[PDB]
Amino acid sequence: AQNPNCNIMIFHPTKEEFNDFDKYIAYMESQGAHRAGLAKIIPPKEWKARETYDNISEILIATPLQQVASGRAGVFTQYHKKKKAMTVGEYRHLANSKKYQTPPHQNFEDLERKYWKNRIYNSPIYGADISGSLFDENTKQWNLGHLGTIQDLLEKECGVVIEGVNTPYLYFGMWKTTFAWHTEDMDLYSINYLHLGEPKTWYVVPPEHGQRLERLARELFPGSSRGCGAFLRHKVALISPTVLKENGIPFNRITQEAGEFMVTFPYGYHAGFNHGFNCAEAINFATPRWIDYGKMASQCSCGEARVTFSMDAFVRILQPERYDLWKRGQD
Ligand SMILES: O=C(O)CNC(=O)C(=O)O
Ligand SMILES: [Mg+2]
Ligand code: NI
Ligand SMILES: [Zn+2]
């Protein structure tokens, strides 16, 4: 069995290997990359996502989100408070202001320490989930707006044409902006490209051990757990690496830098934080191997999760027994 310890693997495809996305995902899996839940892909040196980032300041962040924490430094939830619209150029200035800028630090490890010690005492503002792309239309390899759609994959595997579209999203971050522990909708893959700026630190639980994280989370967030049997779908809970290690939960960590891709694999729980002002693009995708995960994915039906239009068909076709309850939670 490849990668039996479930370590995060880092890949350096050549330009030739970068031409066929699906083939390279399958290659990574043949080497056991999915067992970690997360992989890094460093593009060939010949590749670029676009020519420059000099002309992005007028992009609008219609609803920046202030991420307010409740709990203790290693075990907390966050809610999102909506803020007034602002442009990327305004957000970038905000991120670099004294209130929000990255502190002095020695290295990624020192900054990690500072994040877990101090995050709860501040409320950073995140421009998340903005539909759009920063890939040049002429970038033909690993362009996250030109991947094969999940609706086409489900049709190719199962024979049923479904409605829905699959487009990318932009994330504009600042120091301490935080992504809570989650798997993807319908336990899909995700791919995330860090276009510019400061790094993103990731934590990940192997898919084979996801239920260990879920059991701990029920213990640590007992009011949330009562409310919903899949409350990690709410995407509000944070647990630090120190607390995970105290509770024997298998996990790994890695820092992504600008110009690097990360892929999250089906049922790979992940969480993390941004080091400073940055912009990432991400999108969900599927492969044949996903289908069995999709059919078994847990679902939130309490109302909290609320998701995209295009999830409906995935539940309806893959999980017909669950669909009526889930749809009620949608409405
Ligand atoms: O970058 C972010 O804030 C969160 N990203 C992801 O969870 C992802 O790409 O799957
Ligand atoms: Mg612009
Ligand atoms: Ni994710
Ligand atoms: Zn729920």
Side-chain angles (χ1 to χ4, degrees), residues 150-155 158 160-165 185-186 188 290-291 294-295 299 307-323 326-327 330:
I150 301 156
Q151 293 78 19
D152 289 333
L153 180 287
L154 174 158
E155 173 188 332
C158 300
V160 62
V161 182
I162 56 166
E163 72 290 353
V165 289
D185 286 344
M186 219 71 187
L188 282 158
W290 168 70
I291 291 284
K295 291 177 171 159
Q299 299 299 356
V307 299
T308 184
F309 183 113
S310 314
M311 232 182 92
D312 192 281
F314 304 158
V315 186
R316 194 170 72 247
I317 297 309
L318 302 179
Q319 312 183 300
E321 189 273 325
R322 287 173 167 184
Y323 179 68
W326 172 81
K327 197 168 36 67
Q330 241 33 17

Side-chain angles (χ1 to χ4, degrees), residues 272-293:
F273 66 88
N274 295 307
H275 295 205
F277 170 67
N278 62 20
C279 172
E281 181 168 344
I283 198 175
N284 298 114
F285 71 91
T287 70
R289 198 178 66 80
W290 168 70
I291 291 284
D292 283 352
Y293 286 89

